C-alpha cells in the first residue's frame, strides 16, 4: 500500500520567493564555454563602490539648453557666510538621483554603514585655498553660519600638488539598518545636513581666470550593507 | 620619476609627466589563448605589426557645453581612416581574415598650460553604438568637421538615438520612448577611465582585454571598445593664452588573432 | 585623504582614515548576484490560439496580409514588438485609428538594477489563466528555430499539429497552472544587454542580436478547429532567473527629474 | 457667404530644428501679428515621436499672446510623426463641428521636409481624412526643396510653399479670402 | 547557493538539473593600477 | 483593528517574535491573491497597458 | 507612535484586468500566529469592568 499523507492547506499555490527549483521539461543540454572572458560580479558591491558624479541644481542663471544641471561647484568671490553646498542624507532626495549607491539603494529598502564622498579640485595650479567640509546629526533647525559647522565634525583641506579629500560621513544611528527613503521623514531615515564652507579665500596671480571648480563624488565605504529588495520604480520608461 | 618610455615594434612613445597605466579586470591583460570555436590554425601575433598608431581628434574651445562628447569606434576606426589614422598593415590584413580577435591599450593626448583649468574624461565603454542616429547610415569622415563635438542631447540619455528599424505598414507607427543602449552622464565614471585636467596630468593612459558575447566575433561589424572623450568643466583662459588646444590619440593592439582566408574585401 | 581620484581607481574609507572610531559589523549578504534575480516576475499577456496559427512576417509589411498578431511571446528580457526581436520599446499611448496595435513587451524592473554588460543564466516558465474555469495547453520550440504550422483531418475534424511534435508540450488541470524550468539553448555564448554588430554581413539594421534568445511560449485549448467560441481569451506568462552569473559592468537607466 | 476660417498650426520639434528654432519662432510671431481680426479660430499643436496640444480653440487673444510666448519653452527633440498632428487637428475638428457651423478648416504645417516610405503614407492615410469632412491642406518646408512627395499632402502642386516667395505668398492667400467676413 | 532548502537531497541528478560545461583540454578588487 | 485578546494575558514591555500570515475568503467560490511588502517602504501604484 | 517598529501589510486583489470587473464588492480575512517569541521587564495588565 502507499505511504498515507495528510495535504496542509498550502495546496497548488506558488510563492514567488519559493527556495525550491522545479522538473525541467526539456534536459540534458551542453552549452559554449565561459571562462575565456573576464570580470566576473560575485556581489553589486564590488560595483557599489566605484565614484560617481553626483547631480545638482544650477545657481540662479538657467541656461535654456537641455536639462541645466551641474556635476559641480562654481565658487564665488565674494565675501558672505553662508555655505556653498548643503544637502541632507535621504537616499532619494533630487540631488542623489544618479549616485551609485543611490541607483541600487533605489529598489531595496534598508541598508547599514557609512557613505564616503569625496571631492576633486579642478583649477590652476598657481592658485590655492582653504576649505573645510563638515557634516551635523540631526538638530531642530539646519546649522548655518561657521561657528555652527565649527562645532560639530569636520576637515579642513588645503589645495597643493594633489587634488583630492576622501571624507566618510560617520555612521551614528538609533537602530543599526537605516531606511533608504523616508515616506515619514523620520529621525530613523535622516542623518543631519552636510555642508562645505570657505574659510579662506582662493589666492590667484593676476592673468588667470576667476571662479575655480570642484567635482563631487559619493561611493560606499566598506561597513555599507545592503538588505531584502522590493518591487522597482518603472518610471524611468515614460 | 613619472616617465615611461613604452616601446614595440620598432616605435617607442613616451610622456614625461604621464600618470600610470590603469588595467582592467586582470592584473595582466594581454595574456589569451586561441578561441575554442575554430578549428583551422590561427594566424597569431608578428613583430610588423605591434605597434602604436597615432591620430588626430578633433579641437576644443570655449564654446563647448558640458558632457559633450567625441567618441571613436573600434576597429571601425582602421576601416573609414578618421583624423589621419589609418591601419595601413593592419587593415590590409584585417580584411581577409574573418573571424579578428584582441585587446587593446591607449594613451591620449592633450597639454594644457599651467594658467588653464578644465577637466576631460577619458573612457573606453563597452558594447556602444555611439556613431549614428537611426537613419541606418553609419557616420563617415566627412560629416565630423561640421560639428567638432556631440553636444550631449536628452535624446541619447533617454536612449532615444538607436537605429530603430521599418516597422511595417500592416501596423501603425509608434511611439518610441526607450532603448537599452544609451548614455548616462552622471553615471559615466563606472569604466576604465581617468580625470584628465590641467591640475597634474598632461597625457594618460587606459587599458584593456577582451570581453565578447562569444568567443570571436566578425570582422568588420562589431564594436566593442569605442573610447568617447566628453568635457564636465570647461576652460577659461584670459586672451595672450595659447588658443584652442589639440586632441590626438594612440591606439595599440595586443595579441592579434585572425582566423580564415578569402579574398579582400569588397562590400555589397 | 589625501590621495587623489583623477588616478582612476581609489579605494573606500573607513572611519578611522582621518577620524577617530573603529569600523561596522557586516550586515547582511542580500546582494550577491546569483539570489538577487531568482524572483518569480511576470513579463506579459497571451491571446490564446485556437485554429491552425500564423506568424507575423520579415521587417516590411503592406496591408492585406493574414497573420495572427500578439499569439506568441519571444521571451527574453529585451524590447520586443510583435513577438519579434526590436531594438527599441513602444508605449502606443494615442491608440485611436486603423492599422492594428502591436504587441509590446519590456522586463520594467531588470534594468533597473542592471549595471552589467553581459548575463548569464537559466529560466523558468510559469503560466496563468486570468479568465475563469479555463483548461490549456502550453507549448515551446527552441530559439533559432521556427513552428510548424499545418493542420491534418482526423475523422472529419480538421486537427492541427501542435497538439504533436518532438519539443515539449504541458497540459493543465482544472484552472491550474503549469510551470518547468528550462536550460540555456543558444547559438552565441553568452546573452548580451547592450550590443554592437548586426544580423547579417552588411544590409542589415545594426544593433539587435537575433539568435541570443530563449525562445516563445504559446497558449491553445486542446480542442478541434470547427468547435470554436466566439470570446476571445487571455493568459499571462511568468519568469524567474535561475544560477545567473554576470561580466563587466556599466551604467543604469536614467531617472525623471523631470 | 462665410466667414468660414480657422487656421491651423503645425510646427515640427524634432533635432532638425536645432539650429532654425527662433526662425520659425519668429514666422508665426509675425504670422500671428498680421492680422487684428477675431472672426477666426486659432490652436498650436507640435510633433515631437509624440506630444500634446498647446492651446485650444480660443475667442480673445491675450490667450495666444500667452501661447507665443510659450512656445519658447520646448526644446527641439523628437521624431517626425506628423500623421499624429493632422490627427490632432481633425479630432477636435470633426467633433467640434457639432453646432453646424461652416468653418472651411485650413491648416498651414511647418516641416523639415524629409520623411520615409511609411509615415509618408500615414500621412496620406490622414490627409484623405482631413479634407473628406471639407478642410483646406497647406505645407511649407525649408529644405534642399522636393515638392515630389509633398504635393500628396496638398490639394496639387499650388500649395506647397518655399520659403523664398512664400514670406509674402501665403499672405495674399489669407488676404484673398479675409475681407469677405461678413 | 542562491535561495534552497535542498540541504538533503535532489530529485534529479545534475546533469539533468542544469547544463554544464564543455572541455576546453574573502573577496577579489576589479582591477589594479600597475 | 486592534489584536484583542493578546493585551489579556500582556504582562510585557517589549516583544520579539516572527508571525505567518493566513488568508481566508468568507465569499464562495472565489479564487485570489496576496501581496506583501516590507516595513520601512511603501507600495507601488500604476498601470502599464498590454494588448 | 512608533512608526517604523512594525510588521508591513497584506492585500488581495483577484487575477483580472481592470476593465473586466464587477459590481458587488467582496470580502477576505486575515490571520496572525505568533512564532519563537521572546518577552522583557513586565507590566501591568488591562484594566478589568467592573462597572
Redesign the interface.
Given at each position: 500500500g502507499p505511504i498515507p499523507t495528510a495535504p496542509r492547506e498550502n495546496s497548488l499555490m506558488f510563492l514567488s520567493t519559493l527556495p525550491d527549483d522545479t522538473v525541467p521539461a526539456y534536459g540534458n543540454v551542453r552549452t559554449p564555454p565561459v571562462n575565456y572572458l573576464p570580470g566576473e560580479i560575485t556581489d553589486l558591491l564590488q560595483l557599489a563602490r566605484i565614484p560617481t558624479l553626483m547631480a545638482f541644481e544650477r545657481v540662479p542663471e538657467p541656461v535654456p539648453a537641455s536639462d541645466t544641471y551641474v556635476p559641480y561647484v562654481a565658487v564665488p568671490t565674494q565675501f558672505d557666510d553662508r555655505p556653498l553646498i548643503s544637502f541632507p542624507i535621504t537616499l532619494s532626495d533630487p540631488v542623489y538621483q544618479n549616485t551609485l549607491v543611490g541607483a541600487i539603494s533605489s529598489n531595496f529598502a534598508n541598508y547599514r554603514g557609512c557613505i564616503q564622498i569625496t571631492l576633486t579640485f579642478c583649477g590652476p595650479m598657481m592658485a590655492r585655498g582653504k576649505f573645510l567640509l563638515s557634516y551635523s546629526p540631526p538638530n531642530g533647525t539646519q546649522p548655518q553660519t561657521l561657528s555652527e559647522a565649527m562645532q560639530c565634525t569636520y576637515s579642513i583641506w588645503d589645495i597643493g600638488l594633489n587634488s583630492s579629500w576622501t571624507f566618510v560621513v560617520p555612521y551614528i544611528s538609533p537602530s543599526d539598518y537605516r531606511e533608504t527613503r523616508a515616506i515619514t521623514n523620520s529621525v530613523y531615515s535622516a542623518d543631519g545636513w552636510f555642508s562645505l564652507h570657505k574659510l579662506t579665500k582662493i589666492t590667484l596671480p593676476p592673468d588667470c581666470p576667476q571662479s575655480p571648480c570642484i567635482l563631487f563624488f559619493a561611493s560606499a565605504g566598506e561597513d555599507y550593507t545592503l538588505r531584502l529588495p522590493v518591487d522597482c520604480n518603472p518610471s524611468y520608461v515614460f | 620619476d613619472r616617465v615611461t618610455t613604452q616601446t614595440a615594434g620598432n616605435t617607442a612613445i613616451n610622456t614625461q609627466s604621464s600618470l600610470g597605466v590603469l588595467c582592467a579586470y586582470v592584473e595582466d591583460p594581454t595574456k589569451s589563448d586561441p578561441p575554442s570555436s575554430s578549428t583551422d590554425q590561427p594566424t597569431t601575433t608578428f613583430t610588423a605589426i605591434d605597434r602604436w598608431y597615432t591620430g588626430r581628434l578633433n579641437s576644443w574651445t570655449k564654446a563647448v557645453k558640458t558632457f559633450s562628447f567625441q567618441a571613436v569606434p573600434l576597429p571601425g576606426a582602421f576601416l573609414s581612416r578618421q583624423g589621419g589614422l589609418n591601419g595601413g598593415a593592419f587593415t590590409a590584413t584585417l580584411h581577409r581574415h574573418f573571424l579578428m580577435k584582441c585587446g587593446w591599450q591607449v594613451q591620449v593626448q592633450c597639454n594644457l598650460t599651467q594658467f588653464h583649468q578644465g577637466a576631460l574624461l577619458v573612457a573606453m565603454v563597452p558594447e556602444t553604438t555611439l556613431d549614428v542616429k537611426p537613419d541606418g547610415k553609419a557616420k563617415s569622415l566627412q560629416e565630423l568637421n561640421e560639428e567638432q563635438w556631440v553636444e550631449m542631447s536628452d535624446d541619447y540619455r533617454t536612449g532615444k538615438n538607436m537605429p530603430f528599424q521599418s516597422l511595417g505598414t500592416y501596423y501603425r507607427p509608434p511611439n518610441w520612448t526607450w532603448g537599452p543602449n544609451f548614455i548616462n552622464p552622471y553615471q559615466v565614471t563606472v569604466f576604465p577611465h581617468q580625470i584628465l585636467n590641467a591640475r597634474t596630468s598632461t597625457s594618460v593612459d587606459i587599458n584593456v582585454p577582451y570581453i565578447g558575447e562569444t568567443p570571436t566575433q566578425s570582422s568588420e561589424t562589431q564594436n566593442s571598445w569605442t573610447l568617447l572623450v566628453m568635457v564636465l568643466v570647461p576652460l577659461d583662459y584670459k586672451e595672450g593664452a595659447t588658443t584652442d588646444p589639440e586632441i590626438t590619440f594612440s591606439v595599440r593592439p595586443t595579441s592579434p588573432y585572425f582566423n580564415g582566408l578569402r579574398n579582400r574585401y569588397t562590400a555589397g | 585623504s589625501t590621495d587623489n581620484a583623477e588616478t582612476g581607481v581609489i579605494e573606500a574609507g573607513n572611519t578611522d582614515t582621518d577620524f577617530s572610531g573603529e569600523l561596522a559589523a557586516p550586515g547582511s549578504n542580500h546582494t550577491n548576484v546569483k539570489f538577487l534575480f531568482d524572483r518569480s516576475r511576470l513579463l506579459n499577456v497571451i491571446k490564446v490560439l485556437e485554429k491552425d496559427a500564423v506568424f507575423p512576417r520579415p521587417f516590411p509589411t503592406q496591408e492585406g496580409a493574414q497573420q495572427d498578431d500578439g499569439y506568441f511571446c519571444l521571451l527574453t528580457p529585451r524590447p520586443t514588438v510583435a513577438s519579434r526581436p526590436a531594438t527599441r520599446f513602444g508605449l502606443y499611448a494615442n491608440p485611436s485609428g486603423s492599422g492594428v496595435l502591436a504587441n509590446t513587451s519590456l522586463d520594467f524592473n531588470f534594468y533597473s538594477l542592471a549595471c552589467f554588460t553581459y548575463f548569464r543564466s537559466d529560466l523558468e516558465v510559469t503560466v496563468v489563466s486570468l479568465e475563469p474555469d479555463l483548461e490549456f495547453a502550453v507549448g515551446w520550440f527552441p530559439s533559432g528555430s521556427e513552428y510548424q504550422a499545418s493542420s491534418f483531418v482526423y475523422d472529419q475534424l480538421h486537427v492541427p499539429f501542435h497538439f504533436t511534435g518532438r519539443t515539449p508540450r504541458a497540459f493543465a488541470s482544472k484552472g491550474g497552472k503549469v510551470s518547468f524550468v528550462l536550460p540555456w539553448n543558444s547559438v552565441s555564448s553568452v546573452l548580451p544587454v547592450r550590443w554592437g554588430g548586426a544580423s547579417k554581413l552588411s544590409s542589415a539594421t545594426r544593433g539587435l542580436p537575433a539568435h541570443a534568445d530563449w525562445g516563445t511560449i504559446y497558449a491553445f485549448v486542446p480542442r478541434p478547429n470547427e468547435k470554436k467560441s466566439t470570446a476571445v481569451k487571455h493568459v499571462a506568462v511568468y519568469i524567474r532567473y535561475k544560477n545567473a552569473r554576470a561580466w563587466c559592468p556599466s551604467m543604469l537607466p536614467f531617472r525623471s527629474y523631470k | 457667404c462665410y466667414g468660414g476660417f480657422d487656421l491651423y498650426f503645425i510646427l515640427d520639434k524634432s533635432g532638425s530644428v536645432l539650429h532654425h528654432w527662433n526662425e520659425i519662432y519668429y514666422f508665426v510671431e509675425q504670422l500671428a501679428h498680421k492680422f487684428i481680426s477675431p472672426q477666426l479660430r486659432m490652436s498650436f499643436i507640435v510633433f515631437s515621436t509624440r506630444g500634446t496640444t498647446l492651446m485650444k480653440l480660443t475667442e480673445d487673444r491675450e490667450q495666444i499672446r500667452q501661447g507665443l510666448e510659450e512656445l519658447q519653452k520646448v526644446l527641439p527633440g523628437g521624431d517626425t510623426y506628423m500623421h499624429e498632428g493632422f490627427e490632432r487637428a481633425s479630432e477636435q475638428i470633426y467633433y467640434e463641428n457639432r453646432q453646424g457651423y461652416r468653418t472651411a478648416s485650413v491648416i498651414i504645417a511647418l516641416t523639415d521636409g524629409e520623411l520615409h516610405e511609411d509615415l509618408f503614407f500615414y500621412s496620406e492615410r490622414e490627409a484623405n481624412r482631413s479634407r473628406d469632412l471639407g478642410a483646406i491642406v497647406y505645407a511649407v518646408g525649408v529644405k534642399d526643396f522636393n515638392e515630389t512627395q509633398l504635393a500628396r499632402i496638398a490639394d496639387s502642386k499650388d500649395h506647397v510653399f518655399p520659403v523664398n516667395d512664400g514670406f509674402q505668398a501665403l499672405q495674399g492667400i489669407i488676404h484673398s479670402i479675409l475681407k469677405k467676413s461678413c | 547557493?542562491?535561495?534552497?532548502?535542498?540541504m538533503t537531497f535532489?530529485?534529479?541528478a545534475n546533469?539533468?538539473?542544469?547544463?554544464?560545461?564543455?572541455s576546453?583540454s574573502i573577496?577579489?578588487?576589479?582591477?589594479?593600477?600597475?
Open positions: - | - | - | - | 547557493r542562491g535561495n534552497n532548502g535542498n535532489n530529485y534529479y546533469t539533468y538539473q542544469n547544463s554544464v560545461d564543455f576546453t573577496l577579489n578588487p576589479l582591477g589594479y593600477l600597475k
